[PDB]
Design a protein around this nucleic acid. Sequence first.
RNA 1: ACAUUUAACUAAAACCCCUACGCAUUUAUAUAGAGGAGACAAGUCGUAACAUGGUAAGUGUACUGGAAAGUGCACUUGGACGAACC
Length: 191
Amino acid sequence: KTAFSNVGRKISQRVIHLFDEKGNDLGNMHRANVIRLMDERDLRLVQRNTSTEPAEYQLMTGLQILQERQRLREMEKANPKTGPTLRKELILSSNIGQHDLDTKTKQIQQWIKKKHLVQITIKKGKNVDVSENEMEEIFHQILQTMPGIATFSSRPQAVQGGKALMCVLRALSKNEEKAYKETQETQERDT
RNA sequence: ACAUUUAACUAAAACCCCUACGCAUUUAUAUAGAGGAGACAAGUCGUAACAUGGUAAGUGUACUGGAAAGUGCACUUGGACGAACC
Ligand SMILES: [K+]
Ligand SMILES: [Mg+2]
Ligand SMILES: [Mg+2]
Ligand SMILES: [Mg+2]
Ligand SMILES: [Mg+2]
């Protein structure tokens, strides 16, 4: 998270690949020599590209610093590209009551609808002996509620020496969805 | 609605009416189904309250929510502010 604003008269790095206001390449110069050009022409330096290993800074007028981001306010509006996926966690118990399993199963439907990743963990119930035969039958019971909407990303594993099982769910991908749709129509309509 | 008759040298005889009660009305019971409260006391999801209970608590009202509840507006102390200046 950054902004196209002036860095000020405090430069962290001694050597900077300075750039002219008109786009001319001044070339690498000492940090002290950079401030001389900020006063000589009353201009502000903005870091154009952090990624490059050599420091890159371009000095431009205040109006030039407004027009730049004023276009970054439209590019994201016109073509927003927000793809981060939040990860959610749930820790259930083998002996979880059905009512609590229907309330937590409806919470997963809101997460899958918002394209989140649901990490589900199941633990041995309090003073209850149970294997992984019926302890792994809750995932299939939760996924069934979401037939097309959700599908496994990861699969049940013995995270902690078999006492607990962890799985990850995701929203069905567009392509996958179409495949599911296509299959559903043939079973009933063709018959 | 209904009618004064016979009799009368001692005096008597004669008499006999029609309409109500209902698909009205009152109260209670039985039954399909639905939903409270209590007792008992498991399990499950949380941790709302009691300490400034970890966002002080609560009243009224409104909206909201798996659930205790949360928020807004006004009100209360059945809260506190540490009690010379510095
Ligand atoms: K409270
Ligand atoms: Mg509490
Ligand atoms: Mg509290
Ligand atoms: Mg209140
Ligand atoms: Mg709210």
